[PDB]
Amino acid sequence: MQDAITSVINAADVQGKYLDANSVEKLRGYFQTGELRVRAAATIAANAATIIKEAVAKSLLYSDITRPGGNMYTTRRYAACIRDLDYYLRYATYGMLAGDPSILDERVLNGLKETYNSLGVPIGATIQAIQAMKEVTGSLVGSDAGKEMGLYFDYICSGLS
Amino acid sequence: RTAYPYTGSGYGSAGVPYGQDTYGYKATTAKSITETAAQAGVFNTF
Amino acid sequence: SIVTKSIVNADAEARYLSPGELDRIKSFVLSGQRRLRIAQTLTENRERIVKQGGQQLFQRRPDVVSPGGNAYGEEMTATCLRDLDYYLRLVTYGIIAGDVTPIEEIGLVGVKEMYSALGTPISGVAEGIRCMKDVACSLLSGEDAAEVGFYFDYTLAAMQ
Amino acid sequence: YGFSFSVLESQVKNGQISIKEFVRSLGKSSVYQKQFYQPYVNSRVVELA
Amino acid sequence: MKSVITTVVSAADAAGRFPSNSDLESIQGNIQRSAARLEAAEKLAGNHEAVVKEAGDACFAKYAYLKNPGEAGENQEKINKCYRDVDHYMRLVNYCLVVGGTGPLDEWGIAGAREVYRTLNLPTSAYVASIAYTRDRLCVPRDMSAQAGVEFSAYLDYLINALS
Amino acid sequence: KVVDRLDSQPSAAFEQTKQVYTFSRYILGPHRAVVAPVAMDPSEKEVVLRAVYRQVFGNAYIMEEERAELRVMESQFLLGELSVKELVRALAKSSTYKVRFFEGAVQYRFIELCFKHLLGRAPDNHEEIAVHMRKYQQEGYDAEIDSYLDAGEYDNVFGDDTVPFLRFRGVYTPCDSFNRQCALQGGWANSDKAMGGAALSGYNGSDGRQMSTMIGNYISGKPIPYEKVAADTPLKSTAPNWYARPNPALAPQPAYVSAKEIAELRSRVSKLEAAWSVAVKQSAAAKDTVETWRAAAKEMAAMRGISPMGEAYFGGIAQKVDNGALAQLGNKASSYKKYLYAIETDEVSRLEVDLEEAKGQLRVLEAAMAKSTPMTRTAEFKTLTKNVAAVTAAEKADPLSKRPRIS
Amino acid sequence: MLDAFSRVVVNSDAKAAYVGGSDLQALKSFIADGNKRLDAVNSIVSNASCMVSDAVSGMICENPGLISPGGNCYTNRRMAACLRDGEIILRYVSYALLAGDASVLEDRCLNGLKETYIALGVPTNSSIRAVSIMKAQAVAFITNTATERKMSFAAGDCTSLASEVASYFDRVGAAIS
Amino acid sequence: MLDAFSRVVVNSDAKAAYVGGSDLQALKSFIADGNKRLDAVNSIVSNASCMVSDAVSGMICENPGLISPGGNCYTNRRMAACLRDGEIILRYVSYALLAGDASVLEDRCLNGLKETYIALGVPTNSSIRAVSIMKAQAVAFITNTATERKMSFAAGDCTSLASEVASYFDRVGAAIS
Amino acid sequence: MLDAFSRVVVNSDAKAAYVGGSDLQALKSFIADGNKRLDAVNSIVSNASCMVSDAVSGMICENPGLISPGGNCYTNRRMAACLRDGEIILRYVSYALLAGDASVLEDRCLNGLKETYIALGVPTNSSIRAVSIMKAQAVAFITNTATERKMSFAAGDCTSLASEVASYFDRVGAAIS
Ligand SMILES: *C(=C)C1=C(C)[C@@H](Cc2[nH]c(/C=C3N=C(/C=C4\NC(=O)[C@H](C)[C@H]4CC)C(C)=C\3CCC(=O)O)c(CCC(=O)O)c2C)NC1=O
Ligand SMILES: *[C@H](C)[C@H]1/C(=C/C2=NC(=C\c3[nH]c(C[C@H]4NC(=O)C(C=C)=C4C)c(C)c3CCC(=O)O)/C(CCC(=O)O)=C2C)NC(=O)[C@@H]1C
Ligand SMILES: *[C@H](C)[C@H]1/C(=C/C2=NC(=C\c3[nH]c(C[C@H]4NC(=O)C(C=C)=C4C)c(C)c3CCC(=O)O)/C(CCC(=O)O)=C2C)NC(=O)[C@@H]1C
Ligand SMILES: *[C@H](C)[C@H]1/C(=C/C2=NC(=C\c3[nH]c(C[C@H]4NC(=O)C(C=C)=C4C)c(C)c3CCC(=O)O)/C(CCC(=O)O)=C2C)NC(=O)[C@@H]1C
Ligand SMILES: *[C@H](C)[C@H]1/C(=C/C2=NC(=C\c3[nH]c(C[C@H]4NC(=O)C(C=C)=C4C)c(C)c3CCC(=O)O)/C(CCC(=O)O)=C2C)NC(=O)[C@@H]1C
Ligand SMILES: *[C@H](C)[C@H]1/C(=C/C2=NC(=C\c3[nH]c(C[C@H]4NC(=O)C(C=C)=C4C)c(C)c3CCC(=O)O)/C(CCC(=O)O)=C2C)NC(=O)[C@@H]1C
Ligand SMILES: *[C@H](C)[C@H]1/C(=C/C2=NC(=C\c3[nH]c(C[C@H]4NC(=O)C(C=C)=C4C)c(C)c3CCC(=O)O)/C(CCC(=O)O)=C2C)NC(=O)[C@@H]1C
Ligand SMILES: C=CC1=C(C)[C@@H](Cc2[nH]c(/C=C3N=C(/C=C4\NC(=O)[C@H](C)[C@H]4CC)C(C)=C\3CCC(=O)O)c(CCC(=O)O)c2C)NC1=O
Ligand SMILES: C=CC1=C(C)[C@@H](Cc2[nH]c(/C=C3N=C(/C=C4\NC(=O)[C@H](C)[C@H]4CC)C(C)=C\3CCC(=O)O)c(CCC(=O)O)c2C)NC1=O
Ligand SMILES: C=CC1=C(C)[C@@H](Cc2[nH]c(/C=C3N=C(/C=C4\NC(=O)[C@H](C)[C@H]4CC)C(C)=C\3CCC(=O)O)c(CCC(=O)O)c2C)NC1=O
Ligand SMILES: CCC1=C(C)/C(=C/C2=NC(=C\c3[nH]c(/C=C4\NC(=O)[C@H](C)[C@H]4CC)c(C)c3CCC(=O)O)/C(CCC(=O)O)=C2C)NC1=O
Ligand SMILES: CCC1=C(C)/C(=C/C2=NC(=C\c3[nH]c(/C=C4\NC(=O)[C@H](C)[C@H]4CC)c(C)c3CCC(=O)O)/C(CCC(=O)O)=C2C)NC1=O
């Protein structure tokens, strides 16, 4: 659980040296985007339910995982999805603010693909849902902010694959 | 009857136990790095 | 069913089943002949129980089908009746299981999360099941209508 | 009150953590300490624990 | 992918030469023109579901006969596929603005389209009623910039010139 | 009639490219026509000369230092009194075409090289070669090539204006004619000095035998195995670079294949194949739960239609209309986009992706068990108790030989 | 390639026999219903440009992942390519029905289609679904039980040629599996 | 073949997405240092006739059995080909540095080079050293730390293009190993 | 290669500087003549590209039935595999020369080679000719008595390394006989 400042301090500390010009050079780069990330995390908090409603209706709403036999049939199983998609849109918001994807594999990625295989959850449909959820997130926060929030979505999709 | 069945019990279940073997959180069975390689018999100089 | 949760009740308590539990598994299986007849009535009346079910639902809730309603158009109205076919099916399971345990973990647990997340008015779908209940109990005698209606109103209670 | 620990019901229903883990995380929650920790004394908190 | 890179490294590779100053100069044009053509790749991406919705019904408002039985848009599933195809042609135009040339259109949408639209009996004039409605719904300094409306339209009526 | 006419008939009047070359792999990669213009710049004469040296020599190092007999045959072409057909005939009569592909070549290797160099294709059947064998042995090699390029094949598909190219012609008159094509023109790297093995048999890379593979495929009807048509392959060079969900490119062959990995993989691809045949009979009618009420929810919802914009006022509020073709059926943007997300979310497609993914993992794992006696194994799995026995004593399958010594 | 007359000639040339009267009872019966074979293969060729679009798109409605991006029938090149081998197979089966012998199918259409479709990444189970829809249509048009088009025919039985064109379609199913 | 613009297209096609605001910051940063990339290709192709003789002759002074008789650089025709594939590889790496993606490296240079060099009998481990001297030269020219020719530049960081051209030579050195 | 001499670990956090519980006494003792051994393997592997091509062509020009068609080295796959296997054998003697013992050679290279060469029809009487050339080649190079190539070593003696490496080549040569 490290942000961009924590990761910069760790690497500069792990060699026992002070924060030289290169370490502060990245820190200044993070502070420049500090204004963009909060507004990105602002609108995502507002439209959390709307984004997840848009992703599932755009990716896996009418596919036969939704029908009987599919992986999402019963109401408990459907309700687990939007609960499950809420974490991906939420933890990706944390990575967008912290500027470092360490929180994702610390709290989301580890034991995740090993868990879906146990339950039999389709990893293929899961990643598009996140891909479609990444597509709507670029709608709200804009282009570059979508590039930032989108940079952690595919990090989840990569490791979850 | 759908092929990709699932796990769980009670109603809304496909006749397959949770986790495919009744274990939700499975204890791993792999060894670490250097003696997974020691068992392979090919990474001997490594 | 009554058999599975009378077991898991006495299972948790580290004991066997009392006469109160075993004189009802006994009383339920002798009731099993009459249950299949009741579920057999609703099984091949789904054409009328659903279509007349959505009959009163739109007359009582024209908003949901009017332009802007969730079930607007040829598409959503078909799915508008699809859910009623689901819940009518689960009531046939509850009648044969002698309990809402099939209806509990299917169509009831977390149902408000689904319909809130679909934009559907959950009160509207509750009105749909009530309209199906009057059609269902109109198809059976008084001794049966105290059961078939009995499972609908439980679904009405959990759906709000 | 419509409270929710979806993460904890996740990690316990899958068996990722024990009931004892789910109980301990409930104790260190903030909906707990707002309920049975803030309005009381450390003396009374020990007995209510 | 017919692009500005893959003409100067396809003609140099057939010639067997290193990328000389004639080919580094061509990608200097990929820095000035791409400031505008990615803006039309970004506005089209953030508003794609409303553009195809405003464009795909002009296929059926102009040709109302498609909902007759026996014709192409006769039921529910065939109408949803007709809106799907205009979403495809609006997606490759978003792919062509971000490539730099007509690469994703000449390989993925155009090539073989005259053999599937004749075999499946789709009217290809109904497709260009939807694309030419999108070209004339384009307000040039309101939708995007002045230059990004040039780049977005020049792939649109190229696609019209392909289908007709 | 999807394709009106093949490439062997000439392009009639009204096209710049033939109909089969539009939607084949002609348009993707560098196997196109580079037909000479009428009058041209000597740089543009060098462009059409460099494609001839790539095509008719087959990526051979022509060693531009010498170009010994070449510059008379070049200067007949740079004037314009030699056609591109007559240049590519004259290059196939020289000594530097003979010392590469004739002085060490078998008459199967030579005929299969003239089909790749002069024409585009591979040899199709057996008696197509047996014409060109008997035409060489009675008339000689100078009257072979003259009787080889002046049939009805070259003058229609290239004419006397364009250079030859690899003819991705779409309609292949045996199906193996695509297989031997991509096995001969072996990718963008391999030349025919390499492919026939003329360098490795050569005494210091000179005067070696141009032996041939695929001689067993021209005698008997036998297809090319798939590794020669998918790995060292021009389809990798004119690759579409798609997202192909069964990826056609073969994996490199793994070291340390085990029989325990294959024997569960063959049971897995029999598990999916038996489950695909069940699920495909239930498709498109019984898998759609909303289909059964479409006959009624389509006539329940045909009440109080609104012709302009504005009504369904509903007690005096706005609540208007959309009145398009889509939203009169109530559909949304998530209703036509549900077809693009039908790989994870489908069920029949869920089986056919992992069927062809695991068969493609099977066909390179089973074909890596062509190495038996000194091969060092390993145990990457945790040496579990699952083990098939070695019970192979008596007959278990026994393919039916009803004529055991029938005489 | 051969036909139905020249199939029994190479059968009789394996024992160097003349073509006698005991052999020729099949071939004299072959021209006795030779009107029916042209009356059969006319019904396939008059509906052949809609037989492919009934079948390749009938594969789509059974397996709708092929039109999703990734599935092998997605791009307009790929759909025009899959329609192209929809009518190559229908051309050679109608050739094989006309000659009455399966030799022209197996040395020109199917010889190496299996190794070709492995190399392009074409799924081999879905191509059986394209063939079996064309199997059910060619036995429908020949017996005139097509449920939206009847053609004019003289009265009589035809199910031998419906069986022969059925056996020319499962050769396509057995070649590429 | 692809470039760095159309690699994220066919990645965004595999997801059936539009190229929205998340992916364009990857590409607008790619054209932000687009002047830096063309200043890196120009350091390669200006010394490219001298780098190929620098690298093939460095292979000879390490493994001198190539110019030994019976070797693979003994015959003078066989030497002139080894100077040619030193620079055809440098032609295709410089296209891959120009395009920003190694598709044209994978699909044209390395498309069958491994079974070429087996079937010509070329020693593969010396083809690694012919490639990898050009890796150690191009990361010296792009960082402008070549020890006998410095080129003029506007100053700044360039180490991403150094590791990008070192990633394209491994992709060559692993595909022919 | 790198297990052939044990090294010392001096830094902490290792588990072998402190709880090593041993030092490798059999391989320290081989740096007591380690520079002379390392010059000998450098004398082989700087000529290993030329020693395998001379020896394989040595048995070709003495037994010319192998490059005859029908022989076991006529086709290009077999001729590339024969040059590969002499290169692999010359590497594994150069492991066993470097490590100072033949225990690497007999299980990774010789265990199951005589059963392999009779399972492929490889002439065992000709392959032992191919290693006796490399037996005679390696003792010329280690003693620096090669006719066309010398190397600038230090002043000393390298017999009983030449007879050590000649004792490995017949140990190969009887394991396939
Ligand atoms: C054909 C019939 C035929 C040959 C081909 C040739 C092969 C051959 N060579 C030897 C002996 C040696 N070969 C050596 C190898 C090389 N010498 C070099 O300088 C270069 C680097 C390298 C070749 C590329 C060496 C060093 C020797 C030892 C003699 C010497 O000091 O040069 C043999 C074996 C002879 C024997 O065992 O006595 C053969 C077969 N000779 C041919 O006859
Ligand atoms: C819409 C305004 C038209 C119309 C469209 C229909 N198209 C049908 C099928 C179809 N369309 C395409 C081309 C499209 N798919 C792609 O993947 C791409 C880009 C890569 C494009 C442009 C294809 C390839 C197909 C066949 C496969 C499929 O998608 O089903 C279609 C169904 C035909 C049928 O079922 O018979 C329709 C109805 N038709 C209309 O009504 C208006 C004119
Ligand atoms: C369609 C129902 C399939 C499908 C087919 C694809 N085939 C593609 C190329 C292709 N098809 C054939 C078969 C056919 N052509 C012939 O010439 C002959 C016999 C002489 C036959 C039976 C061949 C040989 C080829 C290769 C030719 C070429 O592509 O140039 C193809 C294109 C792949 C691509 O462009 O890379 C497709 C998509 N795909 C499907 O999903 C269904 C099952
Ligand atoms: C079976 C698939 C059909 C069917 C077939 C029958 N056809 C009969 C007679 C018939 N058909 C033709 C036309 C045919 N001969 C040609 O030379 C050409 C094209 C140039 C064609 C299309 C002829 C000439 C005849 C003979 C009688 C006449 O002159 O009309 C037939 C009657 C018995 C027979 O003559 O073989 C049958 C049973 N009829 C069916 O019921 C199914 C659907
Ligand atoms: C030199 C650094 C090597 C070496 C090279 C040799 N290559 C010989 C022929 C040859 N070289 C290539 C490589 C190159 N040409 C291409 O067209 C492409 C890809 C587009 C590449 C990478 C090829 C394909 C060929 C075969 C061409 C032909 O000869 O027809 C060669 C001469 C063999 C001969 O003349 O018989 C040599 C010596 N060998 C070495 O030892 C170093 C490591
Ligand atoms: C890193 C590999 C180098 C280095 C690179 C930098 N180059 C910078 C600017 C720059 N280079 C060029 C010329 C280039 N652009 C073209 O269009 C063509 C050919 C057609 C070429 C050769 C230009 C035009 C510029 C922009 C400034 C100018 O007007 O000259 C640069 C400055 C930052 C930037 O502009 O991106 C850097 C850091 N410099 C180094 O120190 C290493 C060695
Ligand atoms: C050339 C000097 C010989 C000769 C060689 C051939 N060997 C062939 C195949 C082969 N060789 C080996 C042993 C080799 N591989 C190893 O991994 C090791 C040690 C670590 C050694 C020594 C094996 C295991 C194989 C089979 C698998 C493979 O292909 O590598 C071979 C091919 C046989 C064929 O294709 O018919 C040849 C020609 N044969 C000769 O005639 C001369 C004497
Ligand atoms: C990425 C591409 C892209 C575009 C090209 C536009 C295209 C576009 N404009 C409008 C919508 C509109 N467009 C205009 C603009 C004009 N109307 C005219 O008749 C004049 C020609 C012009 C003045 C400049 C106006 C005034 C509206 C709102 C009312 C209307 O629909 O006309 C709509 C309907 C949805 C909406 O309300 O926005 C669409 C798709 N939007 C996009 O996202
Ligand atoms: C998912 C979408 C979908 C389709 C496209 C069809 C495709 C289709 N058609 C038929 C079955 C058939 N298909 C045709 C084909 C045609 N009829 C004609 O008259 C024309 C020549 C041609 C259309 C242009 C014929 C003639 C039959 C035989 C029965 C009949 O229609 O009379 C079958 C096998 C039996 C069946 O399931 O019905 C299938 C799968 N079915 C589907 O479920
Ligand atoms: C036994 C023979 C033998 C050689 C000939 C040299 C060859 C050589 N040079 C370099 C290393 C290099 N080689 C060059 C090449 C050149 N320098 C230039 O300015 C020109 C463009 C080009 C000569 C025409 C460059 C630029 C470097 C990087 C460092 C530098 O020289 O500035 C390397 C890689 C690093 C290394 O392994 O040491 C090698 C093998 N070394 C040898 O061992
Ligand atoms: C067995 C328990 C169970 C239920 C109940 C269930 C419901 C369910 N209802 C859905 C949609 C829907 N449901 C409605 C329903 C209604 N509109 C109205 O106006 C009415 C108030 C109401 C019906 C009486 C509509 C309009 C949609 C489509 C919404 C959309 O397209 O956005 C969907 C998504 C499409 C689908 O896969 O069917 C599911 C999964 N699934 C289950 O497993
Ligand atoms: C914070 C990191 C984190 C994640 C992500 C997580 C996931 C997680 N997902 C679960 C279930 C589930 N997840 C799904 C999800 C899906 N079905 C589909 O078809 C789609 C592809 C997908 C929605 C995108 C379903 C249906 C279940 C219920 C499975 C069952 O009842 O068997 C469960 C079982 C317990 C429960 O939900 O209470 C866990 C623990 N836990 C974590 O700690």
Strand partners, F210: F105
CB atoms within 10 A of CB E111: 22
User: How far is residue H10's CA from residue G175's CA, in Å, rounded to a whole number?
Assistant: 34
Q: CA angle, corner G84, sides to G78 and G90, nearest 5?
A: 140
Q: Is E146 in the pocket of ligand 8 (CB under 6 A)?
A: no
Nearest one of A61, A73, C80 to F294, comparing CA atoms: C80
CB atoms within 10 A of CB C84: 22
User: How far is residue H83's CA from residue H53's CA, in Å, rounded to a whole number?
Assistant: 7
Chain D CB contacts of B23 under 8 Å are: 15
Question: Position F276: which residue type?
Answer: W
* Angle of helix H34-45 versus helix H76-99 axis, rounded to 10: 170
Question: Position D4: which residue type?
Answer: S
Transcribe D8-36 into DSSP letters: HHHHHHSSSS-HHHHHHHHHTSHHHHHHH
Residues 6 or more apart from C44 whose CB is under 8 A from it? none
User: How far is residue F247's CA from residue F230's CA, in Å, rounded to a whole number?
Assistant: 11
Joined together, the tokens standing for residue G31 give 């021209």
Q: First and final CA of chain E: distance in angstroms?
A: 22
Total number of residues shown for chain G:
177
Nearest one of C124, C151, C128 to C42, comparing CA atoms: C151
Which of left, alpha, beta for E60 (phi over 0: left; psi -120 to 50: alpha)? alpha
Interface test with C, best of F329, F331, F334, F336 (most C CBs within 10 A): F329
DSSP code for H107 = I
User: How far is residue E83's CA from residue F338's CA, in Å, rounded to a whole number?
Assistant: 12
User: How far is residue E23's CA from residue E32's CA, in Å, rounded to a whole number?
Assistant: 16
Domain of E39 in residue numbering reads as 1-164
Radius of gyration of chain A measured on its C-alpha atoms: 18
Nearest one of A10, E17, D9 to H88, comparing CA atoms: E17
Residue pair F335/C75 in contact (Cβ under 8 Å)? The answer is yes
Which atom belonging to ligand 4 lies closest to the Cα atom of G158? 1
Q: CA angle, corner G18, sides to G17 and G19, nearest 5?
A: 115
Give me the phi and psi of G166, to 5 degrees please: -75, -35
Joined together, the tokens standing for residue H19 give 């190229």
Collapsing DSSP states into helix, strand and coil, what is residue F203? strand
DSSP code for F202 = S
Going from the Cα of G144 to the center of ligand 2, the distance in angstroms, rounded, reads 30
Residue pair C72/F305 in contact (Cβ under 8 Å)? The answer is no
CB atoms within 10 A of CB I110: 19
Nearest one of I53, I54, I46, I140 to H64, comparing CA atoms: I46
CB-hemisphere CA count at 13 Å for B11?
Answer: 20
Element at H146 (helix H, strand E)? none
Q: First and final CA of chain D: distance in angstroms?
A: 22
Residue G93 to residues A67, D27, F171, G105: CA-CA distances in angstroms?
A: 39, 75, 16, 7
List domains and CATH numbers for chain G. 1-177 (1.10.490.20)
Joined together, the tokens standing for residue F141 give 């090699």
User: How far is residue E63's CA from residue C56's CA, in Å, rounded to a whole number?
Assistant: 37
Give me the phi and psi of F190, to 5 degrees please: -60, 130
DSSP code for F348 = H
Cα I122 from chain centre: 20
Nearest CA to ligand 10 atom 39: H58
Transcribe C93-134 into DSSP letters: HHHHHTSSHHHHTTTTTTHHHHHHHTT--HHHHHHHHHHHHH
User: How far is residue E138's CA from residue E146's CA, in Å, rounded to a whole number?
Assistant: 11
Residues 6 or more apart from B28 whose CB is under 8 A from it? none
Q: First and final CA of chain A: distance in angstroms?
A: 22
User: How far is residue C62's CA from residue C69's CA, in Å, rounded to a whole number?
Assistant: 8
Cα G57 from chain centre: 18
Residue pair G110/G172 in contact (Cβ under 8 Å)? The answer is yes
Joined together, the tokens standing for residue H80 give 């002139």
Q: Which of I87, I120, I132 to mutate to test the pocket of ligand 7 (most atoms within 8 A of CB)?
A: I120
Question: Which residue from A minimizes the CA distance to B6?
Answer: A120
Chain E CB contacts of H19 under 8 Å are: 41, 45, 94-95, 98
Cα torsion for F124, F130, F135, F141, to the nearest 10°? 70
Residue pair C31/C98 in contact (Cβ under 8 Å)? The answer is yes
Which CATH number fits the domain that encloses residue E25? 1.10.490.20
Nearest CA to ligand 12 atom 3: A108
Going from the Cα of G32 to the center of ligand 4, the distance in angstroms, rounded, reads 11
Nearest CA to ligand 10 atom 9: H54
Element at F118 (helix H, strand E)? none
DSSP collapsed to 3 states, chain B: CCCCCCCCCCCCCCCCCHHHCCCCCCCCCCCCHHHHHHHHCCCCCC
DSSP code for F91 = G
Helix spans in chain I (H): 25-28, 34-45, 48-62, 76-99, 105-108, 114-117, 124-142, 162-175
Which of left, alpha, beta for A141 (phi over 0: left; psi -120 to 50: alpha)? alpha
Q: Is G142 in the pocket of ligand 4 (CB under 6 A)?
A: yes
Task: Mark F111-147 as b/e (b = at least 16 C-beta within 10 Å).
Answer: bbbbbbbbbbbbbbbeeebeebeebbeeeeeeebbee
Collapsing DSSP states into helix, strand and coil, what is residue E123? coil
Cα torsion for A152, A154, A156, A160, to the nearest 10°? -170
User: How far is residue G54's CA from residue G56's CA, in Å, rounded to a whole number?
Assistant: 6
Residue pair G8/G27 in contact (Cβ under 8 Å)? The answer is yes
Residue pair G128/G177 in contact (Cβ under 8 Å)? The answer is yes
Residues 6 or more apart from G93 whose CB is under 8 A from it? G44, G105, G134, G138, G165, G168, G169, G172
Joined together, the tokens standing for residue I43 give 């004398």
Q: Which long-range contacts (CB under 8 A, 24 or more apart) does F367-372 make?
A: F367/F227, F367/F253, F368/F253, F368/F254, F368/F257, F369/F257, F369/F259, F369/F262, F372/I119
Joined together, the tokens standing for residue C17 give 């089943």
Element at C41 (helix H, strand E)? helix C32-43
* Location of structure tokens 């191509």: G127
Total number of residues shown for chain D:
49
* Location of structure tokens 């029994």: G8
Nearest one of I47, I48, I55 to I173, comparing CA atoms: I55
* Angle of helix A4-14 versus helix A21-32 axis, rounded to 10: 180
The answer to whether the CB atoms of A68 and B5 lie below 8 A apart is: no
Nearest one of A67, A44, A73, A72 to A129, comparing CA atoms: A72
User: How far is residue C72's CA from residue E142's CA, in Å, rounded to a whole number?
Assistant: 33
* Location of structure tokens 């036509």: F336
Nearest one of E161, E145, E147, E137 to E50, comparing CA atoms: E137
Residue G65 to residues A127, F174, G60, G71: CA-CA distances in angstroms?
A: 16, 30, 8, 6
Quick check: do I and H touch, 3+ CB pairs under 8 A?
Answer: yes
Question: Which residue from A minimizes the CA distance to H29?
Answer: A144
Q: First and final CA of chain C: distance in angstroms?
A: 24
Nearest one of F277, A148, H92, A117 to G173, comparing CA atoms: F277
User: How far is residue E140's CA from residue F376's CA, in Å, rounded to a whole number?
Assistant: 69
Total number of residues shown for chain C:
160
* Location of structure tokens 């051969």: G2
User: How far is residue G137's CA from residue F342's CA, in Å, rounded to a whole number?
Assistant: 28
Q: First and final CA of chain B: distance in angstroms?
A: 50
The answer to whether the CB atoms of F22 and E14 lie below 8 A apart is: no
Total number of residues shown for chain F:
407
Q: Which residues of A make up each annotated binding site for (2R,3E)-phycocyanobilin? A: 71, 76, 81
CB atoms within 10 A of CB C47: 11
Helix spans in G100-154 (H): 103-106, 113-119, 124-142
User: How far is residue H33's CA from residue F341's CA, in Å, rounded to a whole number?
Assistant: 36
The answer to whether the CB atoms of H18 and A153 lie below 8 A apart is: no
Interface test with E, best of H11, H25, H98 (most E CBs within 10 A): H98
Q: CA angle, corner G65, sides to C75 and E129, nearest 5?
A: 60
Strand partners, C67: C69
Count of domains in chain E?
1
Resolution (A): 3.3
Q: Counting Cβ atoms within 10 Å, is residue C131 exposed (0-12), middle (13-18) or buried (19+)? A: buried
Transcribe F149-186 into DSSP letters: HSSTTHHHHTTTTS-------S--SSTHHHHHHHHHS-
The answer to whether the CB atoms of C74 and F294 lie below 8 A apart is: yes
Q: After which residues is chain I broken (C to N over 2.5 A)?
A: none
Tell me how close the Cα of G74 comes to any Cα of chain H, in angstroms. 11
Residues 6 or more apart from F151 whose CB is under 8 A from it? none
Nearest one of G144, G163, G146 to G154, comparing CA atoms: G144
Q: First and final CA of chain F: distance in angstroms?
A: 52
Q: Is G61 labelled a binding residue? A: yes
Q: Is B10 on the interface with A (CB under 8 A)?
A: no
* Location of structure tokens 């000179």: F206
Q: Counting Cβ atoms within 10 Å, is residue C44 exposed (0-12), middle (13-18) or buried (19+)? A: exposed
**Dihedral of alpha carbons F207, F213, F218, F220, sign:** positive
Q: Which of E24, E27, E33 to mutate to test the pocket of ligand 6 (most atoms within 8 A of CB)?
A: E24
Question: Which residue from D minimizes the CA distance to A83?
Answer: D6
Chain B CB contacts of D13 under 8 Å are: 24
CB-hemisphere CA count at 13 Å for F366?
Answer: 12
Q: CA angle, corner H40, sides to H35 and H46, nearest 5?
A: 120
Question: Position H44: which residue type?
Answer: I
Q: Which long-range contacts (CB under 8 A, 24 or more apart) does F200-203 make?
A: F200/H119, F200/H120, F200/H121, F200/I76, F200/I79, F200/I80, F200/I83, F201/F104, F201/I67, F201/I74, F201/I76, F201/I79
